[PDB]
Amino acid sequence: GPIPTAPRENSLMFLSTLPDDTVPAYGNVRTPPVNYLPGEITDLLQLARIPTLMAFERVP
Amino acid sequence: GPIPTAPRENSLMFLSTLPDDTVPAYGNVRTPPVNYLPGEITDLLQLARIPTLMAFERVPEPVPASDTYVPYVAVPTQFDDRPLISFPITLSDPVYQNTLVGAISSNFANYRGCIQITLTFCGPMMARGKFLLSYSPPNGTQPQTLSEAMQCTYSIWDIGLNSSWTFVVPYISPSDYRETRAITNSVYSADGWFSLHKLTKITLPPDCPQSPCILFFASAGEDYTLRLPVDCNPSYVF
Amino acid sequence: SNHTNVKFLFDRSRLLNVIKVLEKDAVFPRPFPTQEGAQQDDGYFCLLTPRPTVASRPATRFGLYANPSGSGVLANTSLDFNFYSLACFTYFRSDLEVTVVSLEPDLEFAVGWFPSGSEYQASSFVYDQLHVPFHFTGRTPRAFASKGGKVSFVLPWNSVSSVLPVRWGGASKLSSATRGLPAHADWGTIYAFVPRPNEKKSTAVKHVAVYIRYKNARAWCPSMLPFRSYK
Amino acid sequence: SNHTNVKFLFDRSRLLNVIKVLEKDAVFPRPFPTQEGAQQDDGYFCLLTPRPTVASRPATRFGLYANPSGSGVLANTSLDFNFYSLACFTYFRSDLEVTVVSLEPDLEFAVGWFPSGSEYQASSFVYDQLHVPFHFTGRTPRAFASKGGKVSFVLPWNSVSSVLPVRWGGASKLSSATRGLPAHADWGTIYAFVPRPNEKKSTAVKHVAVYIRYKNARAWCPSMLPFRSYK
Amino acid sequence: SNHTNVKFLFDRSRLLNVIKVLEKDAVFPRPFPTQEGAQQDDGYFCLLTPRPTVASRPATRFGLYANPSGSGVLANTSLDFNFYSLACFTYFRSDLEVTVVSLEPDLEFAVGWFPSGSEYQASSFVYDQLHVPFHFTGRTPRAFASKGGKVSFVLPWNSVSSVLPVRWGGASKLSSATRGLPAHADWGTIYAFVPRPNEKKSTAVKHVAVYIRYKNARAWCPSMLPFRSYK
Amino acid sequence: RWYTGRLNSWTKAVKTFSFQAVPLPGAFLSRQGGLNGGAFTATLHRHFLMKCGWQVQVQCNLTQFHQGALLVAMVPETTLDVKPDGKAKSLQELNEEQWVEMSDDYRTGKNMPFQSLGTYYRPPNWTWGPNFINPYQVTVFPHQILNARTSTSVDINVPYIGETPTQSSETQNSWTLLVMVLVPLDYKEGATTDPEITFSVRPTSPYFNGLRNRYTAG
Ligand SMILES: [Ca+2]
Ligand SMILES: [Ca+2]
C-alpha cells in the first residue's frame, strides 16, 4: 500500500459537479419490478413538442 | 485503496512548469468546426523567415520628431574609406529588435543557425552602380577600410539592374547555441561586425532626382534555431 | 526541443488577478455609467479572460489609476502580459486550466462559478435565524479549502462563436455599437466566499488570487506585436 | 452533450438543510398536535427527503415564519427548489447520494442513521459515572470527523412501495386520512453528535448541514410546473 | 558492490549553502567593483554550482572572512568539499537533482528559478494597493510549502558548451580576460520568497538552505587532488 | 463586376509612415470617394447576412524622374475607422486631411471606443491599447509596392474571414485597406506633380442571406 503517489491541490474537496461516486452502504438490496407502470419517460425533448398555450394579453 | 505508497517532499505543490493536468469539469461538451477558417498556423519558424524592416537611424534628421530609426539609407555624394553602415553582430540592437526574429528572440535564451539579410534600393531606374559587402567575424578592431572588408567575409552586389539582393550569415560557433541576451560584448554571443561600402560613385542622366534612397530587410534562414523561451517585460504599457 | 510548437508553447499557468473574499450574497455591479449612491459590490465577481476589463465587465482601452487619490471608486482590470506580448496572430480557440491561489494564510473558503454570459442571482434565505445565500448550492460546481488548498480544474470552449478573435474590429451591438468589444469571448465568472452565514460576517479582510493556463489551443493568421520606445 | 437525458441530468448534490449538533440522548419530537410543557428535542432528527416537512415529520402545505417573533417554538422544513421546479413528471424512483457539511469550523463530531419509518430509541448508560447514549453503537453505521471531514455515502430505495409519487392525491390513513401525504417515500433520518459523554455537555453551540444527490433515477408520466406572477 | 563505478558513486545529495528569505522584488547585486551607496540586495540570488563564487557571481580564488569584524558587506561563497576533494579528473557533464531545505520551522514560502546566464528582472505592480512582484508569475516554474515542504526537482545540462571543465586554464573574455573563469558552467539561480505582498514585509528574519545531487554524469582525463600538510 | 473610386494626391508634403485607410464594405456604404456599388449595395439592407471574398486594383501616376515609394496592404479586424473622438469617420474628415501620419495614439490604439464611468468610479490614466500599429512589422502581410521605378498600379485578392462562417451584412467589417508612403515624394521640378490615386474592387463568391425589407429604420 504505502507508495509514492500523486496528490492534488484540492484533494477530497467538494465541487457541485463532482463526477464520480463514493463508498456504498450495504448489500443484500432488492427492489420491486416497475413493469406494471406505464411508460417510463426518458428525455425532455420527448414532451417538449406537445403544443402549449400562449399567454397573449386580453386587450385592455 | 488504503495501501502503503510513496510521498513527496513537495506533494501537490505548484511550480510554473507543472507537466500534467487535473480533474475535468463536465462531459457532453461539443465544439463547432473551424474548417471554414483559413490556414491554422502551427509554428513560429513558419513566419519568422518573412523579410522584415530594419530600423537604421536617419542621419542627424533635424525634424522635431528627431530620430527616424528606419530601414532605409540615403545615397551620399561623397564616400570615405569607411563603411556606409556598420554594426556589431548582436541580436539586441534596435534594427534586430523589432524584426520577426528580434521579437521572437526577445523571449528566448540562446540562438543557433543563420539569418537572411536582404538589401534594397529606391533611386531612379536610370542609375548604374555597385556596392561591396563584408561580414567581419570577431577580431581586434571593427573594420573600416575597404581593403580590410575585402579580407573579411565579403561579396559585391551589382546595382546595375537589380535594386535588391539577399545574403545569409554563416553559422560559426564553438558552442551549439549562442547567448541571445546582450549581457556583454563577449565571446559567448558577440560575433564581430558588418560593413557596407559603395563600389563606385554616381552615374545618372539628366532630370533624374539626386541622392536617392536605399532600403534593407532581414528575416530568419532555414537553419536558424532558438532555445529556451523566456518571460517578457510589459514596460511598453507606459 | 521543438519549443516553437505553439500548442506546446503556451500550456502553462499564470496569474490572472486578485479579488476580495465574499461573506454574503452580493450586489452585482450595475451596467455603466454608474452613479454615486447606487451602492454595489465591486471586486468579487472574477471575470475569466485576460482581455482588458473593468469592474467585472470587459474593457477596450487600457487606463489605470497612476495616482493614489481622487474621487469615486477604484475599479480593477486584468491583462496577461506574457501571452499578449507573444500573441502575433489573429484568431484563437482553446481550453482553459485554472487553479486557486489564496493570499491570506490559514484560510477556510468556498468558491463557485458560472459560465460565459451567465447572469447572476443569489439572494439568501434564513436557516434558523441564519441567512443562507442561495448560491451555496445551485447550477454550478463548488470546491473548498482544506484549511488552505490548491483547488484546480479546467473548462472548455463554450461560446456560440466559432473562434476567439485575438484582436477585433467589429461592432458589439446594434445600438451603442462598441467597436473592439467581442462580448462572447470568455468563460464566465467565479466567486470565493467563506462557508459561514451572513450573520457571521467578520471585521477581518481577506483576498485571493488565481493562476490560469491555456490548453490545446488553435491559432490563425498573423498579427502585430508592440513596438518599443528607444530611450 | 445530450443534457436532456434525465438520468444524467439530476445526478448532482445539493443542500438539504441545517440541524443542531447533539450532545446527549434526545427526546424525539412528539406527534402533533403538541402542547407547551411536553418538552422535546426539536431540530436534530434530520429527515431525509426534500418533501415539505415540519419538526422531523412530513408536511403537506408550505408555511414559514415570515415574522421574527411570536408564541411557541419555531419548526423547520425542507424543500429542494431546483428539482421541485424541474419536476414536471408524476412517479419516481432512484438512489440517494449524500455528504456531510459542517457549519462550525474545527469541529469533531460523530453521526448516525436509521432507515425510512425506522423508529428511534437510544437511552443512555453510565460508563464509570459517564452516561453512554446507547446510539453510540447499534443497528446502523456511523462515521466520524477528522477534526472536520467530508463524510459521504449512498443509500438505495427501501420502501415497500414500488415507486415514489412525485405529487400525490391519495389518503394517508384509514382514520385522519391526510390527503397528499404518502408516508413511505423517504430514506429515514440521521443525527450528528459529539463523541463525548452527556456529562461533557458544553455551553458552546454548533450546527451542521448536508448536501444530497440523486442516483440512477426513473421517471414516469407528465406533471405541471409552477406559474409565475407577471409583475 | 562495485562502488568504484563513478556514475553510481556521486549520485547523492549534499548541501549547497544558505540564503536569506525574500519579501519583495529585489535589486540584483551590481557587477564588481561595487562601491558603498550603491545599495543592492545581496544574499538571496542563489547561484547553482559548487564552484567558488561570491555575491551571486562566480569566483576564482578562495577567500573568507576569518575575522568577525571589518568595513564593508560580508559576501558569501559555496564549495562542495566532498566532490571537490574527490574530483581527480578534468572534464565533466551531468544532470542535477536538488531539494529544498528550510531553516526556519513552520515556514510558508514560494520559490522560483531561472537558467544559467539568464538575466533577472522582476519589478512589481500594485494589485489594489498591494504590490505584486512580477516574478510571482513568469517564464519559469514555481513551487510552494505545505506549511513546510520538501520541494524536489531536477535540471539538465543547458550550456552551449559541450562539457564542464573540472578545472580551467582558459581566459574568460576578450577584455578583462579572467583566467580560471569558465562562465557558462552552471544551471542559473533560484530565489525563495514569501507568498505575501511587499506591503506585508515583516520584521521577522528567515533563512533557507538546499541540497544538491549529481545525476547521470560523465568524466574525462586525470587531475590532481589536494596535498595534506604533515603536522 | 468591377467597382472603383478615387483617392487624394500623393504630395511632397507627405512623409514616411503617412497613410490613409479604407474599410470593407464601409466604402460602398459611404460611397467613399465617389465609389458606387448600386444594386448589391442596396441589396445589403434587404438581406440580414452575407459572405463574400474580394478582388481589387489601385492606380496612380508616376514618371521615371520621380523617387520615393508607397505601400499597399490589406489588414483585418482593425479599428482604423475609429477616431480619437470614438466614432467612425464621415466623408469630410479624410477628404479634408487627406493623409494620416503616425502618432502614439495609433501606435497604441488608445482611440478605441470607451465607456462613460459615471460618478461612481475613479478616472483612469489611459496609457495602452491592443489595436496598436507597429509599422515595421507590416511586411508579414502579403502586400504590393507602387514606386516610380516599379509600376503605377497593383492587384490583390483576399478571401472571406470572420468568427462565424457568415456575418451580418451591416456589421461585418473584417477587412480594412491601408495605403502608406514608404518614402517621401520627390522629382526634379517640373515633372508629373503630386499624382492622384484611384482604386477598383470586385467581390468574389458573394452570397446574401437573411432576406428581409430594407433595414428596418434606426
Ligand atoms: Ca501518494
Ligand atoms: Ca502512500
Numbering used by the authors:
A (entry chain B): 1 to 60
B (entry chain B): 1 to 238
C (entry chain A), D (entry chain A), E (entry chain A): 28 to 258
F (entry chain C): 62 to 279
Question: How did the manuscript describe this experimental structure?
Answer:
We also imaged SVV complexed with TEM8 under physiological conditions (pH 7 and 37°C). Each pentamer has rotated approximately 20° clockwise compared to its position in the F- and A-particles. As a result, the ER-particle is 8% larger than the A-particle and 14% larger than the F-particle, representing a ~44% increase in volume compared to the native state. In the ER-particle[P], these include VP1 (S1-G27), VP2 (D12-D61), and VP4. However, density corresponding to TEM8 becomes visible on the ER-particle when the map is contoured to a low threshold of 0.11. The receptor density on the ER-particle[P], although visible only at higher contour levels, supports the idea of functionally significant yet transient receptor interaction during capsid transition. The ER-particle has novel VP2-VP3 and VP3-VP3 contacts at the twofold axis. Overall, the SVV ER-particle is defined by rotated pentamers, an expanded capsid, reduced inter-pentamer contacts, lacks the genome, the VP1 N-terminus, VP2 N-terminus, and the whole of VP4.
SVV has a typical picornavirus capsid with four capsid proteins; VP1, VP2, and VP3 are characterized by a single jelly roll fold, where eight beta-strands form a barrel-like structure that is distributed at the exterior of the virus, while VP4 is located on the interior of the capsid. We used cryo-electron microscopy to investigate SVV under acidic conditions and in complex with TEM8 at physiological pH, identifying multiple uncoating intermediates.
